[PDB]
C-alpha cells in the first residue's frame, strides 16, 4: 500500500504536469472558440473577406492551402494578443 | 552503431517527455470521458439545464457560443476536482 | 532586421518546444496505431473480449463509458510498455 | 480582489505556459499542412508512389498499418527539417 517501485506513493507533483495537459488543452478550445465564431468572421464583414488559399497547382497539385494554415497561425495567435488585454484589466470575481 | 550525430546511444530521458504526451493526452480522454457522459449529464437533471450559447448575431453574426467554450473550460476544470479527491484517498492496488 | 523586441534574432531554442510538440504528437500517433490495430485487437482474440462499457443507465443515464475510457488508459500505457523494451533493443540504423 | 488563495493576483507566468500550448498546437498544423498537401504529393510524383501499409491479416488480422504511422513519422520529421532550413534564412519582416 505504501513504497515500492510500481506505487510511490500519491500521485505527486505529477498534480501540475496532468493539470498543463488537461487544462492547457481547455484553453486551447476557448482561445479558438472565440477565434472560429467571433474574430474571423469580424474581420470577414470588415477589414476584408476571410480567406484566400484555393488556390494552386504544380505540374502535380500542390496546394496554397500550405500559407492558409500560416496565415491563421498568424490570426490564432492575435486572438491570444487581444485576449489577453482584454481579460488582464476586467478580471471580475463572482 | 554507438556515438556519431544521428544516434546519440539509446532515446535517452526523452523517455519521460514521450511518456509525458503520450500519458497525458490518454488521461486527458478520461477526463473528458467522465465530464461528457457523467458530470454534464448530472448537472443537466440537477442543478438546472445543461448549456446556452446558441444565443448571438450582431449586424454580422458573432457567437456566444464562445463564452459556452469558457463555461465548460469552467465545468471541465471541476471534473479535474472532483477527480482528484475521490481518488487520492481511494487508491486501491490491485 | 535584427534586434528590437518583435524579432528576437532567428527563432532560438524554441526550436526544441516546437519539436516537442511536433513529434510527441506525431510519436503519440504511432503509439496508438500499434495499439488500435494490432495490441486491441490481440488482447482481443486471445486473452478475452475486446470492451465492456455500454453498461449505464442510473435515475438519467450517465455511463460506464468512463470506465472505458480508463481500462483504455491502462492498456494505452501498456503498448509504450511492450513498445520501449521491444525497441530499445533492435534498435538498428538503416 | 487581490491576494488569497482562489486568485493570485494576475495570471502570472502561465502566460507562456497558456501560450506554449496554444501556439505549439498552432504551430503543429502549419507543419502538417505541409506535409499534407505539399510534400506527400510530392513524394508521390517523384521519388516513388505514396504509401503501402494496407498489408495485412495473421490468423487475426492485425495491420502494417502500425509501420505507416511510423513511416509518416518519419516523413512528419522531415517535413520540420526542411521548415527549418528553409525559414531560418529566409526570415523577412513585413
Redesign the interface.
Known amino acids: 500500500?505504501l513504497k515500492e517501485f510500481?506505487?510511490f506513493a500519491?500521485?505527486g507533483n505529477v498534480?501540475d504536469?496532468?493539470?498543463?495537459?488537461?487544462?492547457?488543452?481547455?484553453?486551447?478550445?476557448?482561445?479558438?472558440?472565440?477565434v472560429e465564431?467571433?474574430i474571423m468572421?469580424?474581420i470577414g464583414?470588415i477589414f476584408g473577406s476571410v480567406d484566400f488559399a484555393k488556390e494552386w497547382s504544380f505540374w502535380?497539385?500542390?496546394?496554397g492551402?500550405?500559407i492558409?494554415?500560416?496565415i491563421?497561425?498568424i490570426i490564432?495567435?492575435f486572438a491570444?494578443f487581444i485576449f489577453?488585454k482584454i481579460?488582464?484589466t476586467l478580471?471580475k470575481?463572482e
Do not use: H, R, T, W
Open positions: 500500500m510500481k506505487e500519491l500521485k498534480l504536469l496532468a493539470i498543463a495537459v488537461v487544462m492547457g488543452a481547455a484553453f486551447n478550445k476557448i482561445i479558438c472558440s472565440l465564431n467571433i468572421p469580424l464583414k502535380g497539385i500542390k496546394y492551402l500550405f492558409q494554415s500560416v491563421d497561425f490564432i495567435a491570444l489577453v481579460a488582464n478580471m470575481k
